[PDB]
From a paper:
Based on this data, we expected that the substitution of Cys467 in [name] to arginine might change its substrate specificity to acidic amino acids and would allow inhibition by [name]. ASCT2C467R did no longer support glutamine uptake, but it transported aspartate instead. Although the uptake rate of aspartate by ASCT2C467R was slower than that of glutamine by ASCT2wt, the results confirm that a single point mutation in the substrate binding site was sufficient to switch the substrate specificity of [name] from neutral to acidic amino acids. In addition, aspartate transport could be suppressed by [name], which opened the possibility to use the compound to trap the transporter in an open state. We determined the structure of the 172-kDa trimeric ASCT2C467R in presence of [name] at 3.6 Å resolution by single particle cryo-EM. Strikingly, the ASCT2C467R structure reveals an inward-open state of a SLC1A member. Compared to the previously determined substrate-bound inward-occluded state of ASCT22, the most prominent difference is the conformation of the loop connecting both helices of hairpin 2 (HP2 loop). It has hinged away from the glutamine-binding site towards the scaffold domain by ~8 Å, opening a pathway to the cytoplasm. In the substrate-binding site we observe a patch of non-protein density close to R467. Although the density is too weak to allow for an unambiguous assignment, it most likely represents a [name] molecule, although the occupancy of the site appears low. Notably, despite different strategies employed during image processing, including 3D classifications with and without symmetry imposed on the trimer or single protomers, only a single conformational state was captured for all protomers, indicating a preferred state of the transporter in the given conditions.
Numbering used by the authors:
A (entry chain B), B (entry chain A), C (entry chain C): 43 to 159, 177 to 489
The structure:
């Protein structure tokens, strides 16, 4: 009786969990021989080919997406005409998202999950500040700046001077900055520039449907990508231990954040115990753990914040609906652990500017992730292509995304709940 | 009395036939010395320079044209709300255009006209399936994917593994696929995405006027291109024999198609003799041979299909006006013989995926060719740039385009006439 | 009392003159040691880095600016429906701007200011005519055509044949030509193509505000650019002599033009003495020298042309407001002396086609310069990037721009004043 009411509703989720559980089985059926006994390199990158085609489609789409959604979502970003009473709420959201992402990078650099087994001088801050502001906007859709060294035989015979050249791989770091600045420009332009907001916001909605079609293709690509990814490692008992250490490190980041950082930020200004606040708001967190979505939590959260932890009733309907779309600390933890776990699963050595352009671009991507159908994974592929990491390891993270999701939902509501607790103590004392 | 009523009406056609007949004369006046006695290579590519400038202008225009006309013509492509009663007519049009193009490629590979006188493994189907879906959309306006080989000294000392890189020459194969998918996306988006259809369909009409100006320049370019093309061959009696074999092979393809393939497709389902149908519709084919245009045939064809070969009168006003713009089998023959005659006039060896991306891109270009002023030749330059063939041989084909046109018009009306004969036998039996 | 009425009004001009006068002081404070005693090349291009960031931002903006302002300003270019009675005025404006620019190039090639201290054959007119009409429009936003030579061992063993390749650096020469032709196309398209004029003219006004923000950043960049530019020369008493010879040559070009060329053009057709005309129009030129702006001159100029040098009263309100925005001979002198002074300040040897694409692109940029905030300097950076000159010397020209501006304003009003004197003698004789 439930063959056309349950399976038809979430057919894509059943299809991708069948494709993952038959992707590990196909990879084990190839690894029973191995990566070189069935067929060698002449057909190794022809068995894994739909798992390359999915990445071709995703890299095709993240060029219109991050430059047409940021223009339409920074031209519709209101200044303090929206209210300076909730601008401290936006500052709190940005600061706690940056602290969440920095805690994720720090914890998955300290615990080091996945690492079980060119020389560039420290002035590559210049190689990032030349990359924020690109030289032109058509040669910043496929290639970025990079400084290489040489010898000129001056002052003796050997000295290392840097020379600059634009090498391949697009810069999403310098194409979200132009998109943000152009969105602020179209907001400042007023009613003369509404045609551009309508054009760039009908172009973003004409790309989300392409994401819908690509995610409908994505079971086949994720099956062959998992199959090609657990064969190339030539080890199955080690990769599941690396995934277990990844889940342990990300759950530890969620627990450490939501039990010691946001309580400390609440205690530093309110100077009342935040655990009484959390004991008031158990049941919205208990249903956010339940349904694993921050949309069905918001009415019950906006209700239950009133009776126990009494607020002024005009900020809890103002910062809470913009606290479940803008403030997402759990997605910041997931992007900043699941993109320094891939950097220790392929040994890319994680230069000190890759930390900055994995931290600020996952702060600037947890505020607009939950509009995309597969939001948290395509917005991880964006920050993987922004630091030139291998995107092919996205399927070992999409395989264990449910264990992380069921405790990732609660941080996104805990953040703006403690923001509602914090912002009421800047108006009860003036 | 007819100096301002006849010459002013078709001045471009008189100008281009004067420029062709003075292009062969100028090429013969240079070949009286030859390609190296007047001036050598220091001024050989300075005498043929306007015939290079015309190709620069055409390659400039086929980037906005095939990506802004396909979006506007696939967003205005109606689904079966247009009618499933004539969706078998569209399937018939696509199948007979593919069969016409395959017959053209097969016949001009078998008879081999024009051939009178890098190693890549058979897995370059991967090099086309990586090219359908490009990696990004700004680096697919000038460069396409291509797999090259090397040696890695593994398993012995010598093995041939493929490595990938994006080499120059744009991919029109993977820029019509994104345009088609984006047009279907803008159709699905409904009334929120009408601004993009108006933008991309005012951008296509603001490029057709550039085609009008370039075709007004085109006499000078075609004169110097013919002059440079019959000098470089260093032979005049052989090139006219190759053009004669080209005209013979394309006329043989038209005759074989319109007398043995579409009759066979009609006989396989209706099982009545199609030559009685053609004996009913002699005179619309006889005036389509006359005026050499499928626009002045359509009222007389839509009339004469009724009285003799009686139809249900609601499909002959429905599939016939969409059978003279969409179904063009003669243009498919002309594109798929005149682009494997250039591949045997310059020895490009015609790899087995170039047959596929000369067959499906001339099936997908005979449905939108007759809106451009010089439609059948610019849409041949498109499929020449899609397979990296030399576009410079377009002027030996535009020189003999009248002998092919006067029997190319009749296939485009014979196709939908037999489609009207076929579709009436899927409703008289239900 | 004047701390919030004078300093708040022109804060950017005070900030940039403080940044220039503290840019020469910082450069002298580094040159007290020199370019290699404080820190060598490992930190020489890290002290001059904001003066590189300003050039990165300017090269980012001149790609949307010159292709979105020319479309919107050539689609709003009226044909002779504006009037053939003032089309000779537009021809006069174009001819005197070309003569002004040619006099500037000739005078700063003859006097040779700043010159105190690859082989390509003369057929690089082909390398410019292949660059006017680019091969495609996405690979003409960052790279242009360039012919290099080789040897093929034919006809002996050594001969020099040219081969072509697209090398880096965008072609603004071939991206204003497509923009002009597209603007004429959108004008011809009529009311079907008003959406594109509104899109490309709301995109140009959404880039002028980015020029406003970049010019607000520009004090820091111009301070560090002046500081890095007077250190690298390793000479301070010579660079100020080169700037003095630059000011002398440009003032000599202004004086020679406005006292011997436009008087000669007036005398060649009217055959009356133009110095009586100038003695009538002393005081509009005397206030144009005063306020240094051609906007506050136009009412007094349009008044004072009537009473003394009597005109037909319908051309002095028609060609004078389009003579203070379109005709700017002083800006043509400044662009065509200040871009062959940089070519003699860095020894780029000034090939005979760089004269043509520094002359016609500064004729085609003095007609739309006075809409940009820093118009005369960004429109100099455009023509410096169009000929691949070093843009880094823009700050030695922006430092002495006031001495040139106060006598550059008077040529832009003298031009259309003598045009009003000229055009009245093609209607008083018919």
């Amino acid at each position: 009786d439930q063959v056309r009411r349950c399976l038809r509703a979430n057919l894509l989720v059943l299809l991708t969990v069948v494709a993952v559980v038959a992707g590990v089985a196909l990879g084990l059926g190839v690894s029973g021989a191995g990566g070189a006994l069935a067929l060698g390199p002449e057909r190794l990158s022809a068995f894994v080919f739909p798992g390359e085609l999915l990445l071709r489609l995703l890299r095709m789409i993240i060029l219109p997406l991050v430059v047409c959604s940021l223009i339409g979502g920074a031209a519709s970003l209101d200044p303090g005409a929206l209210g300076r009473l909730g601008a401290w709420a936006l500052l709190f959201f940005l600061v706690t998202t940056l602290l969440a992402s920095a805690l994720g990078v720090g914890l998955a650099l300290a615990l080091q999950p996945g690492a079980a087994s060119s020389k560039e001088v420290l002035d590559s801050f210049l190689d990032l500040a030349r990359n924020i502001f690109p030289s032109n906007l058509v040669s910043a859709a496929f290639r970025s700046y990079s400084t290489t060294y040489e010898e000129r035989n001056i002052t003796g015979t050997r000295v290392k001077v840097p020379v600059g050249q634009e090498v391949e791989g697009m810069n999403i770091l310098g194409l979200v900055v132009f998109a943000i600045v152009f969105g602020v420009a179209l907001r400042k332009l007023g009613p003369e520039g509404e045609l551009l907001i309508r054009f760039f916001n009908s172009f973003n909605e004409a790309t989300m449907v392409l994401v819908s079609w690509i995610m409908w293709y994505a079971p086949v690509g994720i099956m062959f990508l998992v199959a090609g990814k657990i064969v190339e490692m030539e080890d199955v008992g080690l990769l599941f231990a690396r995934l277990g250490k990844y889940i342990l490190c990300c759950l530890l980041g969620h627990a450490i954040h939501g039990l010691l950082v946001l309580p400390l930020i609440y205690f530093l200004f309110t100077r009342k115990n935040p655990y009484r606040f959390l004991w008031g708001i158990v049941t919205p967190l208990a249903t956010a753990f339940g349904t694993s979505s921050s949309s069905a939590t918001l009415p019950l959260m906006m209700k239950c914040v009133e009776e126990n932890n009494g607020v002024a009733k005009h900020i809890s309907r103002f910062i809470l609906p913009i606290g479940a779309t803008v403030n997402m600390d759990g997605a910041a933890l997931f992007q900043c652990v699941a993109a320094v776990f891939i950097a220790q699963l392929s040994q890319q050595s994680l230069d000190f500017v890759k930390i900055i352009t994995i931290l600020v671009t996952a702060t600037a991507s947890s505020v607009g992730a939950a509009g995309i159908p597969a939001g948290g994974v395509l917005t991880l592929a964006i920050i993987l292509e922004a630091v030139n990491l291998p995107v092919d390891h996205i399927s070992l993270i999409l395989a264990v995304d449910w264990l992380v999701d069921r405790s990732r939902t609660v941080l996104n509501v805990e953040g703006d709940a403690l923001g509602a607790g914090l912002l009421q103590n800047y108006v009860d004392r003036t």
